[PDB]
Design a protein around this nucleic acid. Structure first.
Ligand SMILES: [Mg+2]
Ligand SMILES: [Mg+2]
Ligand SMILES: [Mg+2]
Ligand SMILES: [Mg+2]
Ligand SMILES: [Mg+2]
Ligand SMILES: [Mg+2]
Ligand SMILES: [Mg+2]
Ligand SMILES: [Mg+2]
Ligand SMILES: [Mg+2]
Ligand SMILES: [Mg+2]
Ligand SMILES: [Mg+2]
Ligand SMILES: [Mg+2]
Ligand SMILES: [Mg+2]
Ligand SMILES: [Mg+2]
Ligand SMILES: [Mg+2]
Ligand SMILES: [Mg+2]
Ligand SMILES: [Mg+2]
Ligand SMILES: [Mg+2]
Ligand SMILES: [Mg+2]
Ligand SMILES: [Mg+2]
Lengths: 290, 138, 109, 25
RNA sequence: UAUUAUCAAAUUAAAUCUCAUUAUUAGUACGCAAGGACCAUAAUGAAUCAACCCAUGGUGUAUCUAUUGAUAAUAAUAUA
RNA sequence: AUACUAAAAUUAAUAAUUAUAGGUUUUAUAUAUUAUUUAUAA
RNA sequence: UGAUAAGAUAAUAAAUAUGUGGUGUAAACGUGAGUAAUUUUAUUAGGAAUUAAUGAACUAUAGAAUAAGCUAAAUACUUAAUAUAUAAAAAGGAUAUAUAAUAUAUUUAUCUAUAGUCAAGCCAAUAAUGGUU
RNA sequence: ACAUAUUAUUAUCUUAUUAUUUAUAUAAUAUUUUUUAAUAAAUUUAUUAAUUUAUAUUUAUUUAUAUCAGAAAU
């Protein structure tokens, strides 16, 4: 039905194809071998009728997961069930673990924090499920730009949402987030100022061992209008816009940084027609808070 | 269908192997045929020789070439006997199973699985014991 | 079923095919049967068309004729396509010869 | 049958040997 | 009981008229026990008769295919 | 329908309706090769 | 740790042999049907075709244990790395120290090579009940 | 006069299984190769399903030989 529903259907088909035995795929997903499948009549689990021929599976686009993220499951744990089923696959299956991308996990964190609201459970799952990703020779899933930055933004808005003046636990959250990263794509430099904003908000000295002290380097977003490319253009730096707005709202001093403001207005122009993701996120958080 | 002096196979473990029909029981004209599932009077024309290794041989066989016995025709080679569903089944060789004169239950204890196909009409006539014993009922 | 034996369809049942007539469980308590097509009887009326099937179960040969349009069969599926060496339209001549059907069920397993 | 052919071949060989023995005698 | 087309009752001649097994009543009545009902009903058949070819088997000097031996012919090609 | 009879169907060709047999067309049956193939073009 | 409790990591203490693996049932026990012997038995200071790139399984010595795939993973299986005219090999588990999975030391395991022990294949000579109705 | 049975052989027939033999398959698997499409990636590659070249193992049919067992004969 909705984009999420079709995305779930395609993802389930992708998973089932990549979870079958290697010697059984040629007899199931290859149409020419339909007669062979009918004749052999393999015994499937749960003592049911032998499998019927199935259409072949082609590589899946990230937009399907993005749609599935953008689908609304405010009080439904479907996101948690899908993550569990996806993370339970064998390490050797490269396709399943190579479909996950930094934008994907960043979107999971964002949707979990605003729309689903139960950010605690999803962040616990994602942070806990890291060793298997590392064994899957896929450490780039966790990066400063997408994973760590989104986590810091969620921490900022969580502190804003619920008052917590216990600085020690906040420092522990920051330290665990810092150690959980693997690829360390610290290029925009927003992480350093985000941690400074967290320190000012709570009152603890920023501390990020090994952090690269790069300044704010946000490339200029063109204000031109295009078709599907424009959609991507905004989404490309949408998170960046979310980070900038959270910094501006939480930190009053953030108005000093003119680069963040320049990025904001550029994005705004490039997005004047459509609704602001930041305001929409706040409205969804407020509506779904109860 | 079989008539007087029609040699027909026996597919029971009662020792008898070949039998020759002498009469049809539930028929008026002796020249009428014997269909699948009607009692017939047979005289055995071939039997398996008997041994004496086991004292008090079981009365399952009690068959010697020449003895008179009653049987039920279980399968036939005729190809036009139509059923209600419209299908027709024709076998390769006719066969029968010996049954007791009075009680009606078969002499044998188990039909042999290698030649144990029986027409399904026999079940509708009420011969549940033969159908249950038969390996496959077509 | 008309397209299963349609004369204009290449992939139609012909003499030499081996089929498994499936009997509707709900409508009847029959059992599935496997046989070798000896003849496909076609009559002026479409409904009264039947298949003649042979199978040598163990040491007994069983011929069965089944109305193809009876409401007691849900589907007739093909197991082994016919060979391109038998030279006739109805294979009545295979009985008793070395070309006979033999035991189909055992060969499948 | 191959059994018959083998038997005939053997018999012919042995009859030839017997004839050879008779001629030698 | 004075036409034609059609529909036609009484009547006359003749055909048919059945029988068995099982089940219920009921293991009831009767009987120490063994054994085992009458009255009646239904279902299966047997024998005889009539009709029919949708389907099944036979036939099918309609027709098609395969094939051994011999002979003859049409067309194309080469030659005169 | 029938031994010959008898019965039954048609004998329309006009302002409108009517098919008896043969032939023709369509569909179907039978026979037995055919997807390695039938008709067309690009 | 997980901002609120579902999951996750380490340690400790337990359960699971209806999942995947390993190992043993070529022995022992019982019997005497067949077997009159081109194949069986007994004996021989017997023998060569000159009997295995054989170890089944302990001892002595020396060396090695590498990469992928499938299975959920594996000391399961397949394919590859090098090796006594070449070819042919494997496997890790547990326990304590230190680095940020690795190196150590112990213990039990895997594989190859030589030798020994146990153990094997084949042949020869002599004997092995009665009936020639 | 004649009856049965039990055993053994086959120039005989049937046959389970197995073994081997002459070939076939637009047969399956994996490599390589000439191609056709869809999808995915970043904005040229890969996956999937097909299409020719062979490669190694199987699958099904077929030619032939031997074979438990049964029948027939002696
Ligand atoms: Mg032969
Ligand atoms: Mg009248
Ligand atoms: Mg009356
Ligand atoms: Mg009468
Ligand atoms: Mg007829
Ligand atoms: Mg007809
Ligand atoms: Mg017919
Ligand atoms: Mg006819
Ligand atoms: Mg006229
Ligand atoms: Mg007409
Ligand atoms: Mg007209
Ligand atoms: Mg006409
Ligand atoms: Mg186990
Ligand atoms: Mg032993
Ligand atoms: Mg003995
Ligand atoms: Mg190794
Ligand atoms: Mg191993
Ligand atoms: Mg002989
Ligand atoms: Mg054979
Ligand atoms: Mg033999």
């Amino acid at each position: 039905a909705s984009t999420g529903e079709i995305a779930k259907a395609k993802l389930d088909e992708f998973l089932i194809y990549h979870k079958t035995d290697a010697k059984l795929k040629p007899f199931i997903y290859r149409p020419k071998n339909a007669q062979i499948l009918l004749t052999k009549d393999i015994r499937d689990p749960k003592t049911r009728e032998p499998l019927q021929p199935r259409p072949p599976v082609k590589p899946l686009s990230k937009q399907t997961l993005n749609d599935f993220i953008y689908s609304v499951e405010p009080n439904s744990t479907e996101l948690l069930d899908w993550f569990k089923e996806w993370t339970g696959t064998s390490i050797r299956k490269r396709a399943i673990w190579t479909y996950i991308s930094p934008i994907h996990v960043q979107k999971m964190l964002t949707a979990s924090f605003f729309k689903i609201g139960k950010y605690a459970h999803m962040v616990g799952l994602l942070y806990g499920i890291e060793h298997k990703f590392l064994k899957a020779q896929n450490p780039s899933v966790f990066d400063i730009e997408h994973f760590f930055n989104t986590n810091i933004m969620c921490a900022l808005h969580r502190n804003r949402l619920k008052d917590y003046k216990d600085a020690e636990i906040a420092q522990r959250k920051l330290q665990v987030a810092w150690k959980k990263v693997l690829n360390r794509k610290n290029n925009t430099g927003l992480a350093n100022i985000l941690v400074a904003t967290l320190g000012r908000q709570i009152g603890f000295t920023p501390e990020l061992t090994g952090l690269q002290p790069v300044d704010i380097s946000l490339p200029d977003i063109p204000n031109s209008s295009s078709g599907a490319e424009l959609k991507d253009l905004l989404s490309k730096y949408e998170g960046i816009y979310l980070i900038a707005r959270t910094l501006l709202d939480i930190d009053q001093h953030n108005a000093q940084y003119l680069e963040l403001q320049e990025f904001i207005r550029q994005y705004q122009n490039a997005l004047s027609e459509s609704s602001d993701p930041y305001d929409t996120h706040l409205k969804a958080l407020g509506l779904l808070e109860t | 269908m079989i008539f007087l002096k029609s040699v027909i196979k026996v597919i029971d473990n009662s020792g008898a192997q070949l039998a020759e029909c002498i009469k049809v029981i539930r028929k008026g004209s002796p020249k009428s045929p014997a269909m699948v599932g009607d009692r017939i009077v047979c005289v055995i024309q071939k039997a398996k020789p008997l041994t004496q290794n086991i004292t008090g041989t079981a009365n399952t066989n009690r068959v010697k070439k020449g003895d008179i016995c009653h049987a039920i025709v279980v399968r036939s080679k005729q190809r036009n006997m139509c059923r209600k569903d419209g299908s027709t089944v024709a076998f390769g060789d006719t066969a029968c199973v010996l049954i007791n004169k009075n009680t009606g239950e078969p002499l044998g204890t188990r039909i042999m699985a290698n030649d144990g196909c029986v027409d399904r009409t026999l079940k509708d006539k009420g011969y549940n014991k033969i159908c249950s014993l038969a390996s496959r009922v077509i | 079923k008309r397209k299963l034996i349609s004369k204009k369809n290449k992939d139609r049942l012909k003499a030499g095919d081996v089929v498994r007539i499936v009997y509707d469980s709900s409508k009847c308590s029959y059992d599935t049967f496997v046989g070798y097509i000896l003849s496909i009887d076609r009559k002026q009326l479409v409904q009264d068309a039947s298949l003649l099937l042979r199978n040598q179960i163990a040491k007994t040969a069983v011929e069965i004729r089944v109305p193809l349009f009876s409401p007691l069969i849900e589907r007739i599926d093909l197991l082994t396509p016919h060979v391109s060496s038998r030279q006739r339209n109805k294979h009545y001549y295979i009985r008793g010869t070395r070309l006979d059907v033999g035991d189909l069920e055992a060969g499948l397993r | 049958s191959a059994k018959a052919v083998k038997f005939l071949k053997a018999q012919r060989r042995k009859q030839k040997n017997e004839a050879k023995q008779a001629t030698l005698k």
